[PDB]
């Protein structure tokens with residue numbers, strides 16, 4: 001009977017009105033079955049035509065063993081309710097989580113289902129289960145309880161979460177716990193063995209207060225290695241004209257980021273019109289430029305800090321051999337974080353799956369470091385991604401994304 | 416009427432429409448009273464008092480031989496709350512499943528058979544005027560869903576669905592499809608049983624106030640629905656008419672392209688490239704556009720395709736879903752979706768309008784995505800693909816493409832025109848080959864440019880150019896090096912543009928210059944294109 005926490009949209013902001021993407025017959029049936037039981041438990045209820053709002057709904061298999069889950073793209077509602085979960089109720093972000101050696105993630109979204117939602121706000125939680133070939137109008141539900149995927153749900157459950165976590169935070173004062181959406185990030189410096197046992201302690205402390213947590217045992221994420229990776233120049237015994245050409249061009253690109261790089265001595269080495277395959281020995285004066293530009297290329301950039309008022313931007317580029325690379329930034333050439341994602345050797349691997357897994361890997365790291373997700377510039381056809389991104393999505397959140405139609409001129413510069 | 420009403424509001428911070436009934440045609444006013452009295456008799460409207468209930472204008476017109484009442488609700492519609500959108504998408508016949516008997520039923524008075532929320536009935540007020548002094552000033556409000564109102568279609572559809580819900584549970588075997596004011600009941604029962612259930616449904620709807628067709632079910636197959644001919648065991652588009660003229664306006668080319676596209680869903684081979692190119696001018700609709708020789712060929716070829724009727728089958732969920740793609744002409748592609756060879760569920764085409772340079776493999780990848788989307792929309796699954804491309808051809812492409820592409824389950828089809836990589840650039844420089852240092856430039860004002868090269872062997876050439884762009888000369892310099900080199904050549908350019916076009920490995924383009932470069936690249940045994948930063952001085956090409 002907990003009094004509903006009233007939610008008000010920003011003045012001048014109407015509710016979300018997003019279309020429902022067409023789905024497989026298999027996925028529609030799983031949603032109808034899930035929603036039928038959710039309606040039976042009072043979590044959701046059907047609505048009439050006087051509700052014009054809609055939020056897209058999808059189906060994933062997190063456990064992947066006869067386990068269909070419902071995922072709602074509350075991205076638009078999150079933007080139009082930002083003042084509620086970013087100003088009125090705000091979950092502060094710890095900066096010590098990135099310093100901890102191991103950070104385990106736990107799903108705690110089931111706690112929101114007990115808390116009711118304000119009757120006046122339930123209109124904006126509306127979603128539609130689509131019908132195949134428009135044979136019938138969709139099935140229209142709205143949430144009566146706190147909806148998972150909405151950023152206002154953990155902000156409302158914030159006080160209840162802090163109260164439940166208080167005994168565990170007391171016995172373990174050095175463990176950092178952060179709540180982003182439906183997931184609890186738990187960071188410590190302990191040995192992996194006793195870290196997992198301490199995580200199992202928190203899992204049982206959460207359980208004895210009525211908070212269910214998936215017990216499928218999402219490996220631990222170690223953020224000590226996280227850094228802006230250094231740009232590496234090729235290392236060869238003997239050099240050719242072409243290898244020095246690729247070297248001069250790469251350092252000219254780094255001049256936009258790293259100033260103080262000089263290639264003129266290397267440019268003097270390649271002067272007369274010569275064959276690319278012609279092996280030109282390295283002069284000592286230009287060799288000094290290679291060593292001077294290897295040293296300055298391992299120092300971090302200057303004047304690169306995170307801006308809380310600006311959004312994060314993540315660019316992924318495909319390097320081949322089942323490997324991808326990424327750069328998180330806010331202003332161009334000022335990289336807050338770079339890295340590379342390489343899928344473990346797998347015959348089942350596909351380009352979309354690797355990009356999907358990369359986006360989830362990048363978003364999680366970005367959540368741990370900054371407490372908010374970036375907007376991805378995805379190297380994929382728009383309609384291709386919008387069709388198959390749900391097939392490998394194992395996360396409860398969905399980051400913003402757009403699609404790049406302009407190719408990268410040189411892939412090797414990032415790698 | 417016992418149907419439960421739907422609560423309707425006005426948009427926040429708005430009030431009822433208070434328009435005035437300016438027109439005062441005495442002839443029409445009497446005919447309006449004759450309708451409003453016999454419509455008040457049926458309870459669809461009710462006279463209202465002098466207390467301001469706002470006002471909405473009314474007019475009269477004649478199509479029987481009876482005048483009709485029209486109420487301009489645009490002001491109300493602007494002030495009414497938004498509703499859930501009635502799906503614009505219509506079911507495609509290729510997705511429907513064959514039913515032994517299909518019955519179409521139309522509701523006579525749809526919106527006037529469904530009530531309206533009482534608190535919202537004041538805003539529907541309207542005035543019947545009188546030219547006489549001491550004007551009687553007849554006033555009325557709507558008790559049912561008015562015509563041309565914003566919420567009438569969505570409220571009717573949900574009310575109809577809630578009315579069908581008891582019948583559907585009692586009779587789960589029958590299948591009812593709802594579209595606007597129509598119901599399409601399909602059953603695999605014996606015809607005598609089917610006709611009993613239909614009359615049972617008509618009685619159901621009459622108890623709720625919904626008129627159903629008399630004369631049993633006034634619907635004889637085939638059915639003409641949304642430009643589709645629907646038959647018991649087949650479907651096809653309603654007959655297409657292609658006009659023959661001497662002059663063609665932009666209006667006529669639009670209508671012709673539309674009718675051609677509509678035929679593409681069943682008639683295989685339709686092309687609309689050259690005809691749509693005439694529309695690329697996008698001038699005023701009234702202007703007359705001269706037909707080209709290639710567009711008149713497409714129309715003659717399309718008229719030959721439409722000369723003999725072709726039909727399509729319905730979906731059988733028990734069987735596999737297959738789609739076959741064939742390349743057509745200049746980047747146009749045609750696909751056919753079937754479950755059995757001689758009978759196709761539907762057909763279609765794909766064209767790559769966006770972009771100036773592309774290759775065949777990328778267009779085929781895009782076509783599969785288009786078919787994958789359409790198959791999900793119509794049948795809730797993706798099809799098995801029969802594609803005219805070797806696996807090693809596709810595998811070589813996606814492993815080195817900068818984007819990510821998903822290749823579904825597919826088998827090879829040896830029916831030409833096949834899809835192949837006409838050329839592949841070298842990844843490392845070629846030893847024992849000449850090295851062409853190319854560069855091109857032009858002045859924007861003069862439009863006069865020059866392109867040339869300087870080889871390692873000392874060979875040099877400069878060719879003048881007129882009416883060119885810096886990009887057109889940067890590609891021209893590479894074309895020169897290709898013309899003047901052996902079957903193995905190393906080219907070095909300072910143009911990220913020219914490097915970009917070539918490294919994308921296109922096999923066709925709009926610019927004639929790129930087409931000639933593709934020809935040389937195909938002729939050459941080995942080509943290594945490399946890039947260096949301009950103005951560093953290493954290139955040494957100064958013109």
Ligand SMILES: N#Cc1cc2c(Oc3ccccc3OCCn3ccc(=O)[nH]c3=O)cccn2c1
Nearest residue numbers: 511512513514517590599600601638640646647
């Ligand atoms: N006017 C019109 C019209 C009829 C229909 C329609 O008919 C069906 C209704 C329920 C089940 C299967 C159906 O049809 C399946 C295919 N079919 C269609 C016609 C026929 O005679 N036999 C047959 O098996 C469905 C969708 C749009 N429609 C538009």
